[PDB]
Amino acid sequence: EADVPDVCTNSGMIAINFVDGPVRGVTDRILNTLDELGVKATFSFTVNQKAVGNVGQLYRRAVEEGHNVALRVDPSMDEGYQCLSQDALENNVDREIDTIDGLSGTEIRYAAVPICNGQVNSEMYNILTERGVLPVGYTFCPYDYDDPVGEFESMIEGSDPKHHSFIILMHDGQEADTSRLENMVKIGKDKGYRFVNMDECLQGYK
């Protein structure tokens, strides 16, 4: 397996990575909240299902509002990258990258694939990086805990922004009510962190 970054390349930053959207209505509201709060983030969106109705514009909206769009690689492949033919695996990924580049009007630079202890499948790592796409990890996921906002606050308040940074993994579908997000932003800002997109979080990686 291949190591992936699980913190930013410099201190003082919180990079939220919203993963497995877009979700009709839910994602639109998250984007509204981020815009109002003046924060930048990252959305690792899927493209394994055709975007229905007003979902399609979300891929472009995220980029236009200063966020990064990353590819959440086809979740139906999660069980095992080694289990499909190398060709099947790679062809699918390549098509998804072309699709999300199209929908977002950009060239993606990042992806979200399954992680184990800060590492991803090497075959998948190689497929992405030969295309100039870096799979990313995360420092903390609030859903790993009984009290998500409390554990977040405990971690942030115990840290020091002059030395620390965080990539925080969230899911659109789990934030249908945006109060937790609002609260997490306040907590981070009160402690002195800047909320950044993945481009800024991972500047100069390697």
| Residue 175 beta carbon to Zn ion: minimum distance, rounded to whole angstroms | 12
CB under 5 A: which stretch of 28-36, 59-67, 112-120, 195-203 binds Zn ion?
A: 112-120
Determine the residue type at 135. Answer: P
The answer to whether the CB of 47 falls within 8 A of the CB of 84 is no
Q: What is the DSSP letter of 161?
A: T
| Residue 1 beta carbon to Zn ion: minimum distance, rounded to whole angstroms | 9
CB under 5 A: which stretch of 43-51, 115-123, 146-154, 181-189 binds Zn ion?
A: 115-123
Sorted by sequence, the CB contacts under 8 Å of residue 177 that are 6+ apart come out as none
| Under rule CB under 5 A, residue 35 binds Ca ion | yes
Report the 10 Å Cβ neighbour count for 140: 19
CB under 5 A: which stretch of 86-94, 123-131, 164-172, 181-189 binds Ca ion?
A: 86-94
What is the distance between the alpha carbons of residues 141 and 146, in angstroms, rounded to a whole number? 12
Residue from the set 52, 116, 130, 206 that interacts with Zn ion by CB under 5 A: 116
Nearer CB in complex with Zn ion: 118/161: 118
| Residue 42 beta carbon to Zn ion: minimum distance, rounded to whole angstroms | 15
| Under rule CB under 5 A, residue 144 binds Zn ion | no
| Residue 123 beta carbon to Zn ion: minimum distance, rounded to whole angstroms | 15
Q: What are the DSSP calls for 80-126, one per residue?
A: -GGGS-HHHHHHHHHHHHHHHHHHHTS---EEE---BTTEE-HHHHH
Sorted by sequence, the CB contacts under 8 Å of residue 145 that are 6+ apart come out as 151
- Which residues make up the interface to Ca ion (CB under 5 A)? 11, 35, 87, 162
- Which residues make up the interface to Zn ion (CB under 5 A)? 116
